[PDB]
């Protein structure tokens, strides 16, 4: 009859509630009318092609604007002293001083300074001209199309796959490991040795000459013969100019380690070697499980056989195979969990080990990328912990999982939750305690009475890596051991050079200030996990509500009876954790940024002393770096940072607006609207017009969402405005 | 431990002098023999004393010129954490054991909640000192330090 | 006259009861076969609704 | 030298065929192959594959050949690469 | 509209009915308990879903359960 | 006291299984088989590491440094030989019919027929274990001692030299 | 060139919002 068509019960709502909820439930296929397992699987599979189409289109546009409105070529010729251009600006509201200030990077008009690091990435892989960027944009536009073509193709009956096909896991793993991971990594190693590395050295190897240009002097033979060391005889000289055939070796596969001294980035030869190396593990690994040829494993049976006799895990993992394969919420929560972990692994390894040329010197880009991925990694983790409860409520079969490791979690759930409470309470009581204590004496003017615990455990790890600072005498920095000498030159000499670099971010110096914050982050992790698992383990029910299983993942509440039951659903527990997640990542990004902007200014001394007490954070970090930001537009002038000053205030406004939906609740607003409904009816010249949807206050759950969205958007945008401007201003 | 002990520190030593000069700056406006005078001078001796003591007991002091505690377990610096830590757990357990011992004695007969809001039972018969030997609760553990109602 | 004494202590087996694995004293036990849940039980601790008693099914253990 | 390859590939084939053949097959029986539901193939119409598996030989399928040999080559390249 | 159910664990104390302001429930002759009555939910159409009935139930966990389902003007409690 | 399953009739059974590792029967038979083999390799070896040291060879450690730097006097050569062969034997021994030949293959492995005897075969067994457990212990002693990299024998010589040298240890 | 497109990027909301409005009230 009406929108939403997928929900008839929703479509018959006379109020404005239907339009809202029609949007918020469009992707929840399992709740749609007359849903079948068949319809469920190839809706996702088709929605999957839709997502790919967006990514390729989004990436196509990036290659387009940089080629059309970005200099790039000007950037290539002097990567150190030119600012990359994202795209042009066209805004009628712009005053002349605006068009003025934003004209940068040698552009004919006002543009935006790119902080995505696409310039360094594209330059490192071998893109040298705008023409190259266009061909990529066209190719991605074409890739974006065939994704839609495949999406449309499998929605057709003559090409649609069976659910069982989707549930054949043994073969999907075998291909994804061997093909999706292995081959793609192998193919990339080819681009590196054919284009990236030779493009780095100085030769332009492209489609019209790649067929006639050897990647290596010696033939393809040495690989096939067996002697592969010949691919490492002649590496690039330390004093090598990128994009210049100066001090350029011939080797296409090395393990030098450390950084290319001019670019401060990892060697391309190391990477061409890396991907080639990992491709194999993936390639062999993608041949573990059984398919149609008579050899291979059975995942189920391996899970079945893993039962420790004599307790204490019970039935082990029996029936666990079918619980996962029949539940795509388990799979997603399992996927987000793994993806979320390596998302941070990207953030941690990309600032410590820069992969692209001239990215380490672009301090605004480095800060942005780390902060970017940590918040991305943050939200992903809350999703892995969100599809968890949904699995328990919608897809969990208690009987089929009788006394296995999964079912043993629900029967001692009070143990996991209470100790998470203890660990959270422990960390909080002392981390906050040590902080406040330190502020007291500095107020009292006696900073020599502070509790400054030296992170001696972590410093012991640093010395174990090769850092000759401190007197620890541990592996890779000791007097006699099998570890360092296993270096056998190769990685160690180039890498040990890199670790004792006082300039790079590769293993910075840490102290008492680094101790307190790491505990704050540990507090943030534990508490967030406490909230999320408690929502998961009590998703099917508690003692306050034993039949929570019968109400679904998201419901408003259970009423004011039995003392009150506000925010008792597993959905709300997620919604509460999102707050704690933002706080945690907030502390992480604060800690990363401040320690770096003090390092970049050549003044780590200020961080080492001000980070030990909380007033230092608010003043020497928050207050101190805001001056240039908040003067983006002044009652006297107008700078290029005016965008960020405005967005800074914008973020504050969205943030505070969420507070309205989180503090004030529905019954007040509904009664207010009822008076407004009366008004409109009794007002002449306005009676002629009537609404087609009954005006009602937002729902209890909707408001918690809407408020959280405001809270999260303002949270991000405010810090984004500050992270960029404060860093861009000083550089 | 890139830190060099508070004795051979030039920063931590400099920090001592900086603090007492500021205090000395204040007594110049009050005229000795006056109240605010001693209070300032009494503060100065305490300043000198605490700086003097910290150098005695060890304490490594970073480049910032402030003492950093070492909790690795190093025998040279046990007094910085372990020995105070052992003292804490002692009192922490003692409190825990005395409190537990109370709620247990209350439960049989009476109205148990009556004793919780009002305790006109002081240490019961004599429950406090029972904490002097709390660690003997290890022997309570081998018997029934825990109830067998839920799990093991 | 049926399963549980008048003063006997009994362990709850409902799973949905506030006192799910707890113990409680029985008030009495009606003898009408029609009655689905007799075996009234007193408890020392109240639930989230301030009630101290509840009627249960015949299936429970004693002690 | 290519000889290293053959010797190792050679030994492997020997092992799979005689020395380790029984154990392999034994494990497979007690293991495969897919479950749902149960047995896969019922839906997902794919599905062996009997012919290539068919071997007029007193035992060893072709797959086995490909399977045993590959391991052999890897080892050979492993050693050949390694000396250099 | 909203979905309400009654369970045999009821004891017929009739408090769920007296609590309801829209008259969704009523008492029914039954042989399951000493009261020999039981709650009934005939008029779910007039149910607003406020769970006043649940806060009057003395049974260990509710004998009457309200499951908020599809929304209607009556359930939305609108007077306009 | 004595665990329920450890009767005493078993060869070398003195009642020791504090973690109740062999409580499950079919794996207790598995461990009993695993024991002798660990025992058999070890007994063969200790003499292996002592006599050469006695003749003079810088201990078993230096004995092995040669590969690191006729017939087949090459690590590659020896490795394949050690490999393919130790594979032929073994994963043939598996038989898993009558506890690895009752764990005592006999037959051709008893060319001199000590298996034929009734009670001697059993007393022969208990002797074989005890000696074996003795080796296993020795090997560990040798390993822990050698972990300082001098000599299994020379160690004896050093202590023998003086009872004064002291281990201390952590201790 | 680029002064023709951001407005059709604003004609489009006018068109989209109008069409969607008709779709949701139907
Ligand atoms: C692989 C990634 C992935 C996939 C495929 C899914 C898929 C699904 N999720 Mg999940 N989720 C994920 C990740 C994912 N999620 C992550 C990472 C989190 C952590 C936050 C969550 C948290 C989450 C919750 C809490 C819920 C789901 C739910 C669902 C289901 C229905 C969602 C829906 O249609 O409502 C519609 C979605 C919208 C209408 C989105 C619009 C609102 C957001 C705020 C817009 C983005 C913010 C804002 C607009 C930005 C504008 C700012 C501007 C100023 C620039 C669907 C199966 C729901 C469910 O399972 O039903 C029971 C559910 O309640 N997810
Ligand atoms: C009220 C004042 C105002 C207004 C109306 C604008 C308007 C605009 N600005 Mg300006 N700006 C302002 C103040 C303002 N700005 C101030 C004070 C500063 C600091 C001095 C700037 C600095 C600035 C810069 C640097 C740039 C702009 C740009 C733009 C243009 C955006 C391009 C576009 O439309 O693409 C599309 C529009 C969007 C993508 C917005 C989508 C976000 C929505 C809310 C979320 C998604 C909605 C969702 C899909 C729901 C669907 C519903 C929908 C289909 C109806 C637009 C004309 C950019 C430009 O010139 O374009 C080339 C540009 O780069 N502005
Ligand atoms: C060679 C065979 C093969 C290949 C190449 C693929 C490939 C793919 N499949 Mg298919 N599949 C196969 C066989 C194969 N499949 C078989 C035999 C079956 C069952 C009989 C299936 C059933 C199946 C289903 C049901 C689905 C897929 C899907 C997908 C897509 C996954 C989504 C994605 O793009 O991210 C790919 C990820 C990578 C390429 C990298 C791996 C992730 C790492 C961790 C990222 C980090 C890499 C690096 C460090 C970072 C570089 C960043 C830098 C470049 C900027 C991908 C294109 C999904 C889909 O439809 O697409 C949206 C999906 O729904 N497959
Ligand atoms: C900063 C966040 C914030 C904002 C903006 C508001 C705003 C408002 N509140 Mg609220 N409130 C808040 C936080 C906030 N509150 C918090 C944290 C609480 C907890 C106590 C409350 C509790 C509360 C109560 C109890 C009430 C309000 C009420 C009101 C309204 C008063 C009427 C009014 O001024 O309309 C004008 C709107 C503004 C001034 C907002 C800014 C308008 C912008 C600048 C102009 C429009 C922009 C543009 C055209 C949008 C188009 C862009 C396009 C892309 C969409 C107003 C909407 C009252 C109400 O209902 O009205 C009487 C009321 O009863 N608030
Ligand atoms: C695809 C399947 C396949 C098959 C069936 C073969 C088969 C063979 N390869 Mg080959 N190879 C392959 C893929 C394959 N290869 C691939 C994918 C590569 C690189 C990508 C190579 C690279 C390669 C090299 C460099 C060499 C071979 C050689 C050989 C011959 C090895 C001698 C031998 O049989 O051992 C002996 C068989 C026995 C039964 C011996 C009995 C056992 C005793 C103990 C010995 C044999 C015909 C060697 C050759 O001589 O080429 C002509 C050679 O050096 N291959
Ligand atoms: C005189 C005969 C005799 C008696 C009465 C005991 C009695 C005891 N023994 Mg002992 N034991 C004995 C002989 C004896 N043992 C001999 C001959 C050996 C070497 C074969 C051992 C090796 C041994 C070990 C390793 C342990 C005992 C232990 C014990 C105590 C636990 C029960 C047990 O049987 O073992 C108990 C006091 C355990 C114990 O708890 O000691 C109190 C335990 O630690 N015994
Ligand atoms: C002292 C150590 C020792 C003892 C007491 C035994 C005892 C035994 N072995 Mg054993 N064996 C040993 C070490 C030992 N073995 C070692 C180190 C190896 C590896 C080479 C083997 C390999 C082995 C095999 C393959 C077999 C036995 C078998 C046997 C049983 C019958 C043979 C026999 O008694 O001759 C004992 C004679 C001596 C101990 C003489 C000692 C040397 C002096 C100087 C002469 C008997 C219980 C047989 C069996 O159980 O099958 C049914 C069997 O076939 N043994
Ligand atoms: C076969 C058993 C055996 C024998 C005969 C020896 C003999 C010796 N050991 Mg060794 N040891 C052994 C096992 C053995 N150990 C094991 C299993 C370990 C691991 C804990 C060690 C760890 C060890 C260290 C660190 C040192 C020795 C040293 C020595 C030498 C004299 C000093 C000494 O023993 O200190 C005392 C060591 C122990 C008491 C370890 C316990 C070993 C058991 C109790 C002895 C065997 C038990 C058995 C009942 C012995 C009866 C005699 C009979 C077997 C011949 C002496 C050659 C010292 C040395 O290097 O001198 C130059 C040296 O400092 N041993
Ligand atoms: C079975 C049979 C049957 C058939 O038919 C016939 C015939 C052939 C007769 C048979 C038999 C055979 C045999 C007998 C074998 C054996 C071997 C052995 C026993 C060895 C020893 C074995 C044993 C042993 C070695 C023991 C030993 C001892 C030891 C080590 C100790 C040592 C030491 C010393 C000095 C000192 C140093 O510082 C250290 C140590 C190290 C501590
Ligand atoms: C040494 C040291 C360290 C370390 C530590 C550690 C790492 C440890 C640990 C630990 C642990 C891991 C522990 C555990 C546990 C457990 C459990 C299981 C528990 C329990 C308990 C109880 C039962 C108690 C009770 C009671 C009492 C007795 C008292 C009072 C209270 C109550 C009453 C509560 C560091 C180096 C840091 C520092 C220096 C020193
Ligand atoms: C203000 C407020 C309302 C009233 C809110 C209403 C009536 C929402 C209507 C918003 C109007 C229509 C303007 C919103 C415009 C948005 C930008 C929507 C954009 C359109 C799409 C992106 C969805 C509640 O109903 C409520 C309920 C529970 C707790 C707190 C509150 C609460 O704080």
What φ, ψ does residue F131 adopt, rounded to 5°?
Answer: -65, -45
Q: Ligand 4 centre from A675 Cα, in Å?
A: 18
Q: Which two tokens stand for residue C8?
A: 């006997």
Q: Of the ligands numbered here, which is closest to the C-alpha atom of A275?
A: 3
For chain A, list the contacting chains (3+ Cβ pairs, <8 Å).
B, C, D, E, F, G
Q: Ligand 1 centre from A555 Cα, in Å?
A: 16
| Sequence-ordered list of residues with C-beta below 8 angstroms from that of A684, at least 6 positions apart, any chain | none
SS3 category, A303: helix
Q: Which of A555, A560, A694 sits opposite E78 (nearest CB)?
A: A694
Query: Distance, in angstroms, between E8 CA and closest chain A CA?
Result: 16
Question: Would you tell me how many other CB atoms lie within 10 Å of the CB of residue A290?
Answer: 22
**CATH class, range A1-731:** mainly alpha
The answer to whether the CB of A730 falls within 8 A of the CB of A601 is: yes
What φ, ψ does residue A259 adopt, rounded to 5°?
Answer: -120, 150
d(CA F34, CA F37): 5
Placement of tokens 């330059």 in the chain: A123
Q: Of the ligands numbered here, which is closest to the C-alpha atom of A539?
A: 1
- Select from A366, A347, A358, A375 the least CA-distant residue to A728: A366
Chains A, E: CB contacts within 8 A come to: 51
Q: Kindly write down the DSSP assignment for every residue of E13-58, as one continuous string.
A: --HHHHH-SS---EEEE-SSSTT-EEEE---GGG-----TTGGG--
Query: Cβ C51–E31 below 8 Å, yes or no?
Result: no
What is Dmax (Cα atoms) for chain B? 74
Q: Ligand 11 centre from A700 Cα, in Å?
A: 12
Query: Cβ A559–E73 below 8 Å, yes or no?
Result: no
| Sign, Cα dihedral of A92, A364, A578, A346 | positive
Placement of tokens 């006696």 in the chain: A446
Whole-Å CA distances, A499 to A274, A352, A464, A594, A619: 20, 10, 11, 21, 32
- List, as residue ranges, the binding site of E for [4Fe-4S] cluster: 10, 13, 16, 20, 47, 50, 53, 57
Query: Distance, in angstroms, between C15 CA and closest chain A CA?
Result: 8
d(CA A368, CA F104): 70
SS3 category, A593: helix
Q: How many domains does the structure of chain F reveal?
A: 1
Using a CB-CB cut-off of 8 Å, the residues of chain A touching C20 are 543
- Select from A200, A178, A213, A362 the least CA-distant residue to A287: A178
d(CA A688, CA A681): 9
Distance between alpha carbon F55 and the CA centroid of its chain, in Å?
22
Cβ(F73) to ligand 6 under 6 A?
Answer: no
Using a CB-CB cut-off of 8 Å, the residues of chain A touching G23 are 3
Question: CB burial class (10 A; 0-12, 13-18, 19+) of residue A212?
Answer: exposed
Q: Kindly write down the DSSP assignment for every residue of A645-673, as one continuous string.
A: HHHHHHHHHHHHHHHHHHHS-HHHHHHHH
Buried-exposed string E45-70: b where 16+ CB fall within 10 A, e elsewhere = eebbbbbbbbbbbbbbbbbbbbebee
Distance between alpha carbon A544 and the CA centroid of its chain, in Å?
36
d(CA A354, CA A123): 14
Q: How many domains does the structure of chain D reveal?
A: 1
- Tell me which residue has its CA closest to atom 40 in ligand 9: F138
Q: Name residues 26-65 of chain D within 8 A of F (Cβ).
A: none
Task: For helices F59-68 and F152-161, give the axis angle rounded to 10 degrees.
Answer: 150
Q: For residue D79, what are the domain limits?
A: 1-84
To one decimal place, what's the resolution in Å?
Answer: 3.0
Placement of tokens 């076969």 in the chain: C33
d(CA A693, CA B103): 60
Cβ(A657) to ligand 4 under 6 A?
Answer: yes
Q: Ligand 7 centre from F125 Cα, in Å?
A: 8
Cβ(F14) to ligand 6 under 6 A?
Answer: yes
Q: Which two tokens stand for residue B130?
A: 């029972």
Chains C and E touching, counted as 3 or more CB pairs less than 8 Å apart = yes
Q: Which residues pair with E39 in a beta bridge?
A: E27
| Sequence-ordered list of residues with C-beta below 8 angstroms from that of A585, at least 6 positions apart, any chain | A374, A375, A377, A378, A524
Task: For helices A328-352 and A37-68, give the axis angle rounded to 10 degrees.
Answer: 20
CATH number of domain containing C41: 2.30.30.50
| Sequence-ordered list of residues with C-beta below 8 angstroms from that of A709, at least 6 positions apart, any chain | A658
Q: Which of A445, A450, A605 sits opposite B66 (nearest CB)?
A: A450
Q: Specify the DSSP element, H or E, that contains A442.
A: helix A413-443
Using a CB-CB cut-off of 8 Å, the residues of chain F touching A309 are 24, 27
Give the residue, out of B86, B89, B97, B148, with the most ligand 10 atoms within 8 A of its beta carbon, to mutate for a pocket test: B97
Between vectors from CA F53 to CA F51 and to CA F59, what angle results, nearest 5°?
135
d(CA B53, CA B57): 6
Q: Which two tokens stand for residue D23?
A: 């154990």
Cβ(A660) to ligand 11 under 6 A?
Answer: yes
Q: Ligand 3 centre from A176 Cα, in Å?
A: 6
d(CA A455, CA B68): 10
Query: Cβ C20–A563 below 8 Å, yes or no?
Result: no
For chain E, list the contacting chains (3+ Cβ pairs, <8 Å).
A, C
Cβ(A664) to ligand 4 under 6 A?
Answer: yes
3-state secondary structure A369-437: HHHHHHHHHHHHHHHHCCHHHHHHHHHCCCCCCCCCCCCCCCCCHHHHHHHHHHHHHHHHHHHHHHHHH
Q: How many domains does the structure of chain B reveal?
A: 1
Query: Cβ A310–F23 below 8 Å, yes or no?
Result: yes
Cβ(F136) to ligand 8 under 6 A?
Answer: no
What φ, ψ does residue A516 adopt, rounded to 5°?
Answer: -65, -45
Cβ(F16) to ligand 6 under 6 A?
Answer: no
Write down the experimental method used for this entry.
X-ray
Query: Cβ A90–G24 below 8 Å, yes or no?
Result: no
Q: Which of G2, G6, G23 sits opposite A3 (nearest CB)?
A: G23
Q: How many domains does the structure of chain E reveal?
A: 1
Is A471 an interface residue toward F (CB < 8 Å)?
no
Q: Which two tokens stand for residue D75?
A: 């080892």
Cβ(A48) to ligand 3 under 6 A?
Answer: yes
SS3 category, D59: coil
Q: For residue E74, what are the domain limits?
A: 1-80
- Tell me which residue has its CA closest to atom 5 in ligand 7: F128
Nearest CA in chain A to G6: A90
CATH number of domain containing B149: 1.10.8.110
Contacts 24+ apart (CB under 8 A), C17-22: C17/C54, C17/C56, C17/E60, C17/E61, C18/A543, C18/C45, C18/C47, C18/C48, C18/E60, C18/E61, C19/C43, C19/C45, C19/C47, C19/E60, C20/A543, C21/B149, C21/B150
Q: Kindly write down the DSSP assignment for every residue of F44-96, as one continuous string.
A: HHHHHHHHHHHHSSSHHHHHHHHHH---S-SHHHHHHHHHHHHHHSSSSTT--
SS3 category, F122: helix
SS3 category, A293: coil
Q: Which two tokens stand for residue A96?
A: 């002349």
- Tell me which residue has its CA closest to atom 22 in ligand 7: F40
| Sequence-ordered list of residues with C-beta below 8 angstroms from that of D40, at least 6 positions apart, any chain | A164, A168, A170, D33, D34
Q: Ligand 2 centre from A110 Cα, in Å?
A: 15
């Amino acid at each position: 009859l009406r929108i939403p068509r997928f929900s008839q019960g929703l479509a018959q709502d006379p109020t404005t509630r239907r339009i809202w909820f029609g949007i918020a439930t469009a992707h929840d296929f399992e709740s749609h009318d007359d849903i079948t397992e068949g319809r469920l699987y190839q809706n996702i599979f088709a929605s999957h092609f839709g997502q790919l189409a967006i990514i390729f289109l989004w990436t196509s546009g990036n290659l387009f604007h940089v080629a059309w409105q970005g200099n790039f070529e000007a950037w290539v010729q002097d990567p150190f002293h030119v600012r990359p251009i994202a795209h042009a600006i066209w805004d009628p509201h712009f005053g002349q001083p605006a068009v003025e200030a934003f004209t940068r990077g040698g552009a004919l008009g006002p543009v935006n300074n790119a902080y995505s690091g696409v310039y360094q990435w594209w330059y490192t892989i071998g893109l040298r001209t705008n023409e190259d960027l266009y061909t990529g944009a066209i190719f991605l536009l074409f890739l974006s199309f065939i994704s839609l073509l495949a999406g449309w193709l499998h929605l057709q009956p003559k090409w649609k796959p069976s659910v069982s096909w989707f549930k054949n896991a043994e073969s999907r793993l075998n291909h994804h490991l061997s093909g999706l991971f292995g081959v793609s990594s192998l193919a990339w190693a080819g681009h590196l040795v054919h284009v990236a590395i030779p493009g780095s050295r100085g030769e332009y190897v492209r489609w019209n000459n790649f067929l006639d240009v050897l990647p290596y002097p010696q033939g393809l033979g040495p690989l096939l013969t067996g002697q592969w060391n010949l691919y490492a005889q002649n590496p690039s000289s330390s004093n090598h100019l990128f994009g210049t055939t100066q001090g350029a070796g011939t080797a296409i596969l090395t393990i030098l380690g450390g950084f290319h001294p001019q670019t401060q980035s990892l060697w391309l030869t190391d990477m061409a070697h890396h991907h080639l190396a990992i491709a194999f593990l993936f390639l062999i690994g993608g041949l573990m499980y059984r398919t149609n040829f008579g050899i291979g494993h059975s995942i189920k049976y391996i899970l079945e056989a893993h039962i420790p006799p004599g307790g204490r895990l019970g039935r082990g993992h029996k029936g666990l195979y079918d619980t996962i394969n029949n539940s795509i919420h388990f799979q997603l929560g399992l996927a987000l969990a793994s993806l979320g972990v390596i998302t941070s692994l990207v953030a941690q390894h990309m600032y410590s080990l820069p992969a692209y040329a001239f990215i380490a010197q672009d301090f605004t880009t480095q800060a942005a990328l780390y902060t970017h991925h940590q918040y991305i990694a943050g939200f992903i983790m809350t999703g892995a912990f969100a599809h968890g409860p949904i699995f328990f409520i919608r897809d969990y079969n208690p009987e089929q999982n009788a006394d296995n490791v999964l079912a043993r979690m629900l029967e001692h759930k009070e143990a996991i939750i209470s100790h998470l409470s203890w660990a959270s309470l422990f960390l909080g009581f002392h981390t906050l305690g040590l902080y406040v204590h330190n502020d007291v004496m500095l107020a009292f003017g006696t900073p020599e009475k502070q509790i400054l615990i030296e992170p001696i455990f972590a410093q012991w790890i640093q010395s174990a890596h090769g850092k000759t600072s401190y007197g620890f005498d541990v592996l890779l920095s000791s007097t006699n051991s099998p570890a360092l000498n296993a270096g056998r030159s190769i990685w160690l000499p180039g890498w040990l050079n890199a670790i004792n670099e006082n300039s790079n971010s590769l293993f910075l110096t840490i102290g008492p200030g680094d101790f307190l914050v790491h505990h704050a982050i540990a507090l943030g992790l534990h508490t967030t996990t406490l909230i999320l698992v408690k929502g998961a383990l009590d998703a099917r029910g508690s003692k306050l509500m034993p039949d929570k299983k019968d109400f679904g993942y998201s419901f408003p509440c259970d009423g004011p009876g039995r003392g009150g039951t506000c925010d008792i659903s597993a959905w709300d527990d997620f919604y509460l954790a999102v707050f704690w997640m933002l706080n945690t990542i907030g502390w992480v990004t604060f800690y990363w940024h401040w320690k770096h902007i003090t390092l970049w200014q050549g003044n780590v001394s200020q961080f080492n002393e001000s980070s030990t007490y909380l007033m230092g954070w608010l003043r020497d970090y928050l207050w101190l770096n805001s001056s240039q930001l908040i003067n983006g537009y002044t009652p006297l002038v107008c700078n290029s940072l005016s965008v960020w000053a405005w967005m800074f205030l914008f973020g504050h406004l969205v943030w505070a607006t969420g507070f309205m939906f989180l503090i004030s609740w529905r019954g007040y607003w509904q009664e207010l609207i009822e008076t407004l409904a009366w008004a409109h009816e009794r007002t002449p010249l306005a009676n002629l017009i009537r609404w087609r949807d009954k005006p009602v206050a937002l729902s209890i759950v909707q408001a918690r969402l809407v408020g959280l969205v405001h809270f999260s958007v303002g949270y991000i945008f405010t810090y984004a405005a500050f992270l960029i401007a404060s860093t861009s201003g000083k550089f | 431990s890139g830190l060099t002990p508070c004795k051979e520190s030039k920063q931590f030593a400099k920090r001592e002098k900086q603090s007492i000069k500021k205090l000395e700056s204040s007594l110049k406006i009050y005229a000795a023999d006056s109240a605010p005078a001693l209070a300032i001078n009494a503060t100065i001796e305490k300043t000198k004393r605490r700086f003097d003591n910290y150098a005695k007991q060890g304490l490594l002091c970073g480049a910032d010129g402030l003492p950093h505690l070492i909790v690795s377990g190093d025998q040279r610096h046990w007094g910085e954490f372990i020995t105070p830590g052992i003292l804490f757990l002692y009192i922490a357990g003692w409190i825990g054991w005395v409190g537990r011992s109370y709620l247990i004695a209350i439960r049989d007969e009476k109205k148990p909640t009556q004793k919780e809001i009002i305790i006109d039972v002081p240490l019961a018969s004599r429950l406090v000192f029972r904490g002097f030997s709390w660690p003997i609760a290890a022997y309570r553990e081998l018997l029934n330090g825990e109830l067998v109602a839920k799990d093991v | 006259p049926i399963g549980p004494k008048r003063g006997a202590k009994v362990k709850i087996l409902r799973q949905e009861s506030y006192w799910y694995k707890g113990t409680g004293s029985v008030v009495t036990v009606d003898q009408d076969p029609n009655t689905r849940y007799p075996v009234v039980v007193r408890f020392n601790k109240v639930n989230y609704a301030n009630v101290s008693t509840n009627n249960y099914a015949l299936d429970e253990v004693e002690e | 030298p290519s000889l290293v390859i053959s010797l190792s590939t050679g030994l492997s084939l020997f092992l799979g065929r005689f020395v380790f053949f029984n154990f392999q097959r034994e494990n497979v029986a007690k293991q495969v192959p897919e479950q749902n539901g149960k047995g896969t193939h019922f839906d997902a119409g794919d599905e062996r594959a009997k012919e290539y598996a068919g071997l007029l030989k007193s035992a060893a399928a072709i797959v086995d050949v490909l399977a045993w040999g590959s391991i052999g080559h890897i080892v050979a390249y492993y050693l050949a690469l390694t000396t250099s | 509209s909203h979905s309400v159910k009654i369970y045999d664990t009821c004891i017929g104390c009739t408090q769920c009915v007296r609590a309801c302001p829209t008259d969704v429930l009523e008492m029914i002759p039954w042989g399951g308990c000493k009261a020999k009555q039981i709650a009934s939910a005939p008029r779910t159409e007039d149910c607003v879903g406020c769970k006043r009935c649940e806060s009057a139930c003395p049974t260990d966990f509710l004998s009457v359960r309200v499951y908020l389902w599809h929304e209607t003007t009556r359930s939305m409690g609108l007077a306009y | 006291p004595r665990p329920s399953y450890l009767d005493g009739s078993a060869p070398g059974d003195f009642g020791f299984d504090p973690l109740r590792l062999g409580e499950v029967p079919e794996n207790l038979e598995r461990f009993k088989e695993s024991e002798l083999i660990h025992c058999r390799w070890a007994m063969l070896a200790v003499p292996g590491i002592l006599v050469p040291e006695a003749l003079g060879l810088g201990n078993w450690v230096k004995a092995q440094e040669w590969a690191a730097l006729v017939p087949w006097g090459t690590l590659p050569t020896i490795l394949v030989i050690e490999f393919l062969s130790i594979a032929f034997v073994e994963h043939q021994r598996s038989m898993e019919k009558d506890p690895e030949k009752k764990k005592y293959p006999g037959g051709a492995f008893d060319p001199l027929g000590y298996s034929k005897d009734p009670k001697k075969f059993h007393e022969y067994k208990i002797k074989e274990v005890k000696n074996g457990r003795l080796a296993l212990l020795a090997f560990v002693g040798i390993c822990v001692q050698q972990s300082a990299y001098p000599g299994t024998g020379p160690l004896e010589n050093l202590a023998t030299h003086l009872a004064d040298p002291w281990h201390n240890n952590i201790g | 060139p680029s002064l023709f497109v951001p407005l059709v990027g604003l004609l489009f909301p006018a068109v989209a919002m109008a069409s969607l409005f008709l779709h949701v009230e139907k």
